[PDB]
Amino acid sequence: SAVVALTNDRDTSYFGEIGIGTPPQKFTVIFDTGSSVLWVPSSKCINSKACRAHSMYESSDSSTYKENGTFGAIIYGTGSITGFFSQDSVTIGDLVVKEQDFIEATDEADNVFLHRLFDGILGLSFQTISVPVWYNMLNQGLVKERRFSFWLNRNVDEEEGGELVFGGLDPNHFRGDHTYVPVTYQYYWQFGIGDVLIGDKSTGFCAPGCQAFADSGTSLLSGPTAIVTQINHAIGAN
Amino acid sequence: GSAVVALTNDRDTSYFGEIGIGTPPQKFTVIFDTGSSVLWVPSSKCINSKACRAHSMYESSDSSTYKENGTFGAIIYGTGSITGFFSQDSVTIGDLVVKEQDFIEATDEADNVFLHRLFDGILGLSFQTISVPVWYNMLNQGLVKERRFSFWLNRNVDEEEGGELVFGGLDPNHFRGDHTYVPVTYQYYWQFGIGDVLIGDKSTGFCAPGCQAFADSGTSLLSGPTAIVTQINHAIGAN
Amino acid sequence: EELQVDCNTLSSMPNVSFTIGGKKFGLTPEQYILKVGKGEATQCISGFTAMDATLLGPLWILGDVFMRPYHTVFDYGNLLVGFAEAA
Amino acid sequence: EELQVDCNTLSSMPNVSFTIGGKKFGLTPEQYILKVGKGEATQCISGFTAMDATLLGPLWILGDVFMRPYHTVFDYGNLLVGFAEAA
Ligand SMILES: *[C@@H]1O[C@H](CO)[C@@H](O[C@@H]2O[C@H](CO)[C@@H](O[C@@H]3O[C@H](CO[C@H]4O[C@H](CO)[C@@H](O)[C@H](O)[C@@H]4O)[C@@H](O)[C@H](O[C@H]4O[C@H](CO)[C@@H](O)[C@H](O)[C@@H]4O)[C@@H]3O)[C@H](O)[C@H]2NC(C)=O)[C@H](O[C@@H]2O[C@@H](C)[C@@H](O)[C@@H](O)[C@@H]2O)[C@H]1NC(C)=O
Ligand SMILES: *[C@@H]1O[C@H](CO)[C@@H](O[C@@H]2O[C@H](CO)[C@@H](O[C@@H]3O[C@H](CO)[C@@H](O)[C@H](O[C@H]4O[C@H](CO)[C@@H](O)[C@H](O)[C@@H]4O)[C@@H]3O)[C@H](O)[C@H]2NC(C)=O)[C@H](O[C@@H]2O[C@@H](C)[C@@H](O)[C@@H](O)[C@@H]2O)[C@H]1NC(C)=O
Ligand SMILES: *[C@@H]1O[C@H](CO)[C@@H](O[C@@H]2O[C@H](CO)[C@@H](O[C@@H]3O[C@H](CO)[C@@H](O)[C@H](O)[C@@H]3O)[C@H](O)[C@H]2NC(C)=O)[C@H](O[C@@H]2O[C@@H](C)[C@@H](O)[C@@H](O)[C@@H]2O)[C@H]1NC(C)=O
Ligand SMILES: *[C@@H]1O[C@H](CO)[C@@H](O[C@@H]2O[C@H](CO)[C@@H](O[C@H]3O[C@H](CO)[C@@H](O)[C@H](O)[C@@H]3O)[C@H](O)[C@H]2NC(C)=O)[C@H](O[C@@H]2O[C@@H](C)[C@@H](O)[C@@H](O)[C@@H]2O)[C@H]1NC(C)=O
């Protein structure tokens, strides 16, 4: 129902375009399955150079904007945003999501956000404080399937960086059937996993069972010390 | 057409849109300008220039497809000037990726002219002078179907788009009737011959034997021979 | 050069036409006058500025004032410029 | 963490597999090593970082290193996550 082309930044972040407002003001965002808020930099960003290095949202230039003003803040896995909630139409691919709430950020940590190519983040995890973009998609009947999917390509100068599909799957980007596992805790997109093996060696710690979530907004793998030390030792990483 | 660029209208006096330069693409706001032929953006190496520091800059060391050039480049516009050096990178416009595009990264910019404007740089669409323009590389690389590009410029209003540039075609939703086509008479600007200029049905006489004009999306107003403009401004009571 | 007009008098200003390809391309006052500022503080500026340059003949620059009411096609393959009423 | 490996030694590194839904999801060294830079100045970073956190049980974050070789489906209607070999 909607395809979003993604840019691969050095294999460490992936982002695509969205529009906010009428007419659409364009933003580059990370589509992040590990977080639940939508924020972009505000036109009202006083002294956050991060904000001024990036595309800014101007509610006065949008005919579908509806004020909210509620205070909002987010403490990421390193950094954090603050601003106020606003409502506008958000355009994604062919989809127009109405009455979508987002934070227009009036402060951002520069250390974290200034040296990044994306403007903001579109959270795809389960709802916390605001109805996320996806839930609105569902509520407004805009998707054919209650599913979204990611293809993330390797970092290759002349290739597409990846592709996100709302409301379906792109069969050109996988082989075989998907192996599906139930969500075990609805916060992140979290599920159960078993043993983690080095070659056919067991690392033991997760053999009785672990948890994992799939986080497109995270670069690497993060896991239990007991297993990671084994892996990093085995492969001779510092 | 193979690529559509949405334009922002700033107070009816400038129109601009987005491009990316580099891998991954660094973003810039640029005027698409049929009155000039060079592509330039502010350089990360900008030398005592306040205009740069307030605008988005290009950092060659952040781009994996950057190729050094370093040839001196300068541009004296219809107001002031920018100076820098040539570099080469991929230029992303809409979903086209123009490879091997040369552009100036400006290390000095005329603050009086560029410092307090909403765009970062300029993408020239006129005929080649010192470097192969973006449009020619587009064509060369087969990125467009038709060897044409077109502009819809809207009035300055709040619920509406500012405008739309189409590379490689037309948008029929933004015109009525057939286009009247005239041949380019001097290949520098997109220049063509014109006839008499009339105030109502009154001839202004001076261009009756034939004058020249070029279409300049990077210019705000209409500029012309004093001998005619004086008459028009008198007629409308400007002063 | 930043000539202003009385915003009240656009309804008694004439159309100004350019002949191109033998065809008249008119501009109405509402098109050739630039509005600056808003609602009540608005200033009305003449869109016609004087500039004397010659390249084959006396030269006009048809900037945004003209390219707003006329949709413009730049035909590189045939080296043509085309104008039609914008919509 | 930010541990590095000798870029010349990936050819003999082991695959690392995650068991999910009873199926082994392997990662090759080419997949689990993050390369920074090109040809000569390339740095090779381990994609495995330590983080001791619990939500119900010991928790892994499977980021882009995993989501590249495995195409991922987020099934909201059925509350499932699905993985297939990417192409
Ligand atoms: C300014 O912005 C904030 C942030 O977006 C707004 O606050 C949130 O608003 C949403 C609605 O868009 C809230 O979510 C909704 O919650 C209800 C259930 O209520 C929850 O809290 C109740 C009491 O406070 C409690 O009774 C209940 O059990 C539960 O914990 C859902 O029914 C509703 O879901 C339905 O609609 C959505 C889509 O709209 C669908 O996805 C669902 O399937 C259902 O059809 C939705 O999930 C959210 O909880 C609010 N969070 C916070 C902390 O603000 C704020 O909205 C205004 O204030 C809130 C508190 C509500 O009263 C709004 O109705 C109210 O407008 C914004 N201000 C305004 C006025 O726009
Ligand atoms: C650093 O940057 C400058 C500014 O661009 C370069 O100089 C210019 O390079 C371009 C080449 O990209 C020259 O244009 C070409 O000139 C030839 C000869 O007339 C044309 O045949 C060629 O056209 C063909 O290819 C085009 C695309 O490349 C198509 O559009 C044409 O239709 C056709 O297929 C194109 O017109 C400029 O004339 C040249 N300008 C000047 C005065 O500097 C530097 O490029 C190098 O130096 C040049 C003088 C020339 O030797 C090039 O071959 C060199 O690459 C550039 N330096 C580096 C390191 O690249
Ligand atoms: C100066 O130039 C303007 C703009 O071209 C002229 O006004 C416009 O004239 C058109 C035809 O002469 C009008 O078009 C009609 O539109 C309606 C829409 O429902 C059609 O049904 C109809 O059949 C025509 O196509 C157009 O409405 C009008 N544009 C406006 C309103 O600004 C102007 O013409 C003069 O004013 C108009 C209002 C009429 O009174 C004309 O008779 C009159 O000549 C031009 N003025 C001069 C000096 O010629
Ligand atoms: C680590 O994982 C990778 C990917 O799972 C392994 O490489 C691939 O392994 C498959 C076998 O599962 C191999 O397939 C060939 O085997 C058959 C020969 O007629 C045929 O059934 C098949 O279609 C292929 O010709 C495939 O070529 C290979 N491709 C890669 C490297 O991407 C890897 O093992 C490798 O393959 C085995 C067969 C052997 O050649 C190893 O030396 C290769 O490195 C796994 N490595 C380890 C150390 O287990």
Side-chain angles (χ1 to χ4, degrees):
Chain A
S1 287
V3 177
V4 177
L6 307 177
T7 296
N8 177 343
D9 183 8
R10 297 165 285 147
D11 272 343
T12 56
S13 63
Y14 293 79
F15 42 78
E17 297 320 328
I18 65 175
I20 305 181
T22 311
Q25 302 170 44
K26 294 156 176 32
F27 302 87
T28 290
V29 298
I30 293 177
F31 296 88
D32 186 15
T33 59
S35 64
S36 64
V37 197
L38 170 57
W39 64 272
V40 298
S42 189
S43 59
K44 303 158 172 69
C45 214
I46 298 206
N47 282 289
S48 185
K49 82 119 87 161
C51 299
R52 232 273 252 279
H54 283 101
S55 301
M56 287 168 261
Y57 175 69
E58 179 46 69
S59 59
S60 78
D61 305 8
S62 170
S63 95
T64 32
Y65 164 69
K66 184 174 130 131
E67 118 137 26
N68 175 307
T70 294
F71 174 86
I74 290 146
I75 295 69
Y76 279 104
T78 331
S80 88
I81 244 55
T82 49
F84 56 98
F85 279 93
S86 303
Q87 196 183 78
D88 208 326
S89 291
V90 174
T91 299
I92 293 172
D94 304 343
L95 300 178
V96 182
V97 182
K98 286 194 300 96
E99 328 190 19
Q100 172 72 43
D101 291 351
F102 57 99
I103 291 164
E104 17 174 333
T106 56
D107 148 72
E108 312 167 16
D110 335 69
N111 359 290
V112 203
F113 293 112
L114 177 71
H115 292 99
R116 338 292 274 91
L117 286 155
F118 59 90
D119 300 315
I121 305 177
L122 188 158
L124 293 170
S125 69
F126 294 105
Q127 175 176 325
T128 49
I129 43 62
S130 191
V131 181
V133 164
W134 171 249
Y135 287 45
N136 275 319
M137 271 178 191
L138 306 158
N139 176 254
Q140 307 174 20
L142 306 168
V143 288
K144 144 150 89 170
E145 305 175 0
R146 304 183 292 159
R147 310 186 303 179
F148 55 92
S149 61
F150 283 82
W151 172 59
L152 309 181
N153 197 14
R154 310 171 151 78
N155 175 24
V156 162
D157 287 347
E158 9 284 332
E159 276 178 31
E160 317 159 83
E163 179 187 86
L164 160 64
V165 183
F166 286 100
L169 318 197
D170 187 341
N172 291 330
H173 289 308
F174 61 96
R175 340 159 54 232
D177 282 341
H178 285 79
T179 295
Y180 288 97
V181 293
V183 166
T184 48
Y185 196 88
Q186 187 172 144
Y187 187 90
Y188 304 111
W189 288 84
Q190 181 176 143
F191 49 87
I193 70 173
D195 201 20
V196 179
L197 292 88
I198 304 162
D200 289 68
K201 213 159 77 230
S202 185
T203 52
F205 182 89
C206 282
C210 284
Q211 300 285 133
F213 62 96
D215 185 4
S216 71
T218 286
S219 189
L220 306 183
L221 315 180
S222 313
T225 294
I227 294 167
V228 167
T229 45
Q230 288 181 64
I231 295 170
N232 274 328
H233 274 0
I235 63 170
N238 312 151
Chain B
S2 318
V4 175
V5 185
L7 306 174
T8 296
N9 182 340
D10 178 37
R11 296 164 277 160
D12 273 342
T13 49
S14 75
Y15 294 78
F16 45 76
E18 173 207 303
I19 63 172
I21 305 175
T23 292
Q26 299 168 45
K27 231 193 263 166
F28 302 89
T29 294
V30 296
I31 291 178
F32 294 85
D33 186 11
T34 52
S36 67
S37 64
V38 203
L39 167 63
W40 68 265
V41 291
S43 184
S44 62
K45 294 119 171 115
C46 201
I47 297 169
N48 331 288
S49 176
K50 164 107 181 101
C52 300
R53 58 196 64 146
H55 287 103
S56 308
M57 298 156 263
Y58 172 69
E59 178 50 71
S60 59
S61 66
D62 284 352
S63 166
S64 61
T65 45
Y66 165 70
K67 174 158 113 127
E68 32 231 291
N69 180 308
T71 294
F72 175 89
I75 298 154
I76 298 73
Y77 280 103
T79 337
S81 91
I82 71 94
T83 58
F85 53 98
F86 279 95
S87 294
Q88 191 199 84
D89 214 329
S90 293
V91 169
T92 302
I93 302 169
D95 73 295
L96 306 180
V97 173
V98 189
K99 250 79 133 169
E100 303 184 319
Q101 176 64 45
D102 292 345
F103 58 103
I104 297 171
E105 58 177 292
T107 56
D108 337 0
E109 304 172 31
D111 291 334
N112 77 289
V113 198
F114 295 104
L115 163 52
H116 284 108
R117 302 320 275 178
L118 303 187
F119 54 90
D120 299 308
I122 294 173
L123 191 157
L125 286 167
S126 72
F127 297 107
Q128 173 161 341
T129 50
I130 65 189
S131 170
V132 179
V134 165
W135 167 248
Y136 290 46
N137 282 320
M138 269 184 184
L139 299 171
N140 192 239
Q141 299 176 21
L143 295 166
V144 290
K145 23 179 203 95
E146 301 172 15
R147 300 178 29 104
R148 311 193 290 185
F149 53 92
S150 55
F151 282 81
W152 174 60
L153 302 189
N154 201 10
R155 306 188 283 294
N156 170 28
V157 175
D158 93 316
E159 41 160 27
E160 304 179 41
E161 313 149 87
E164 175 187 86
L165 160 67
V166 179
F167 289 97
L170 302 202
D171 191 343
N173 296 332
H174 286 309
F175 60 102
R176 309 200 346 114
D178 277 356
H179 292 76
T180 293
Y181 290 100
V182 293
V184 168
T185 47
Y186 195 99
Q187 187 165 160
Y188 190 91
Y189 309 113
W190 291 82
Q191 184 178 146
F192 50 87
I194 63 164
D196 202 16
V197 176
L198 346 163
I199 305 172
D201 300 280
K202 257 45 236 147
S203 171
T204 52
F206 183 83
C207 278
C211 282
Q212 304 285 132
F214 60 96
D216 187 357
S217 70
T219 277
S220 173
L221 307 179
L222 305 187
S223 301
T226 301
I228 294 166
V229 171
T230 183
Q231 297 184 62
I232 294 160
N233 276 329
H234 175 48
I236 66 186
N239 66 79
Chain C
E1 188 72 43
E2 181 62 346
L3 312 209
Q4 304 209 6
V5 296
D6 182 342
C7 291
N8 289 157
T9 65
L10 269 62
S11 77
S12 67
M13 293 180 194
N15 292 340
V16 175
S17 294
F18 292 86
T19 313
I20 311 175
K23 181 197 216 224
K24 299 317 161 176
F25 287 79
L27 302 169
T28 56
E30 298 61 35
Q31 292 160 353
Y32 62 65
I33 294 298
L34 179 71
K35 289 182 191 235
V36 181
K38 232 176 62 239
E40 277 61 27
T42 299
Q43 1 171 62
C44 292
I45 281 71
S46 181
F48 302 90
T49 58
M51 194 251 348
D52 292 301
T54 295
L55 213 186
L56 302 207
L59 192 68
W60 291 81
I61 310 172
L62 304 184
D64 298 339
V65 161
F66 189 89
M67 293 185 65
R68 272 188 287 277
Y70 294 114
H71 178 278
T72 306
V73 170
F74 301 83
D75 186 345
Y76 186 83
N78 296 125
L79 259 235
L80 306 173
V81 180
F83 300 110
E85 177 194 346
Chain D
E1 291 286 284
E2 300 327 76
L3 303 190
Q4 301 202 8
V5 294
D6 170 341
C7 290
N8 296 300
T9 64
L10 265 77
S11 33
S12 54
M13 286 175 187
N15 291 332
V16 174
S17 291
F18 292 84
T19 316
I20 312 175
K23 179 169 175 139
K24 286 171 169 21
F25 287 82
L27 302 170
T28 61
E30 182 263 327
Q31 288 164 355
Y32 66 63
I33 298 305
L34 174 67
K35 293 188 169 94
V36 185
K38 220 99 44 38
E40 305 325 293
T42 299
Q43 332 203 301
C44 292
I45 280 61
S46 171
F48 300 90
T49 58
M51 159 219 75
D52 299 308
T54 290
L55 177 28
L56 300 186
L59 186 75
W60 286 83
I61 310 180
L62 303 178
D64 297 341
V65 160
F66 191 87
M67 289 182 67
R68 269 187 293 276
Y70 295 112
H71 178 277
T72 304
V73 178
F74 299 88
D75 187 346
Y76 185 84
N78 292 125
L79 287 172
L80 316 160
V81 182
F83 296 115
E85 175 191 341

